[PDB]
Design a protein around this ligand. Structure first.
Ligand SMILES: O=C(O)c1cccc(-c2cccc(CO)c2)c1
Ligand SMILES: [Cl-]
Length: 242
């Protein structure tokens, strides 16, 4: 049961942008979106792929645990937070592409492809370079497909160990207070048009969980903060968060 609420378009147009928010009420098994078409249009996952990539790296032993240190390779990159050592937690927090590129190389094409199929993840197509296919290869995923994948992770139903799923959900922790917990991952796709930003995850309440997946046009990096801001305005409008 899906419902289209075009009134949310105001949250995008008011910021001179276009995009989609998809919400899923777990208790009621009901979905909501401002744009049914765009909700099912498939985009590069970009750094949202760090969720499945983390799961695979942990389950195969490429990553021992969330404490293992991935040493900076000494190559100065334009994002200061990348020029340092990281563990799984900080690598997720700062979307440290080069750490996850090495994960993918150690995972390898064959095992990566099999795992994405087992996860039913997007179009399951890793065509391209194994260390960048989620940035400029053939893999694609829609907002509704993100929700489906995230729900499996929440319920520990993905075909990796419970431990791997618990660790990745810890690493997804973004915000927590007395009212809610948000576990999510941002994404920023620039190598293939249209340039977009992602924010996918869920909101944990005392008595329910709301899954969310949004993407929006992102012609410049100046609007990246709108990914979370627009999502939270929708959540506030729907009285999911205060
Ligand atoms: O999604 C973000 O919030 C985020 C976090 C860390 C880095 C970036 C990012 C911004 C511009 C270019 C590049 C490419 O090197 C990356 C975006
Ligand atoms: Cl946690």
């Amino acid at each position: 049961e899906w419902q289209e609420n075009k009134s949310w378009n105001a949250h995008f147009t008011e910021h001179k942008s276009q995009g989609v928010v998809v919400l899923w009420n777990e208790n009621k098994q009901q979905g909501f979106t401002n744009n049914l078409k765009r909700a099912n249009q498939a985009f590069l996952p970009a750094s949202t792929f760090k969720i499945p990539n983390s799961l695979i790296a942990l389950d195969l032993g490429v990553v021992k645990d969330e404490h293992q240190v991935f040493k900076w390779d000494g190559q100065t990159r334009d994002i200061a937070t990348w020029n340092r050592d990281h563990n799984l937690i900080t690598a997720m927090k700062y979307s440290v592409v080069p750490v996850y590129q090495e994960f993918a190389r150690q995972i390898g094409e064959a095992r990566m492809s099999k795992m994405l199929h087992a996860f039913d993840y997007g179009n399951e197509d890793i065509s391209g370079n194994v260390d960048s296919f989620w940035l400029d290869g053939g893999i694609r995923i829609s907002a509704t497909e993100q929700i489906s994948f995230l729900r499996k992770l929440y319920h520990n139903k993905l075909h990796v160990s419970e431990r791997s799923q618990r660790i990745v959900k810890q690493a997804m922790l973004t915000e927590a207070n007395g009212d809610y917990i948000i576990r999510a991952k941002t994404g920023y796709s620039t190598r293939i048009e249209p340039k977009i930003g992602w924010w996918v995850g869920w909101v944990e309440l005392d008595d329910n969980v709301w899954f969310f997946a949004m993407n929006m046009d992102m012609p410049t990096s100046d609007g990246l903060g709108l990914r979370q801001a627009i999502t939270k305005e929708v959540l506030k409008q729907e009285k999911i968060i205060p």
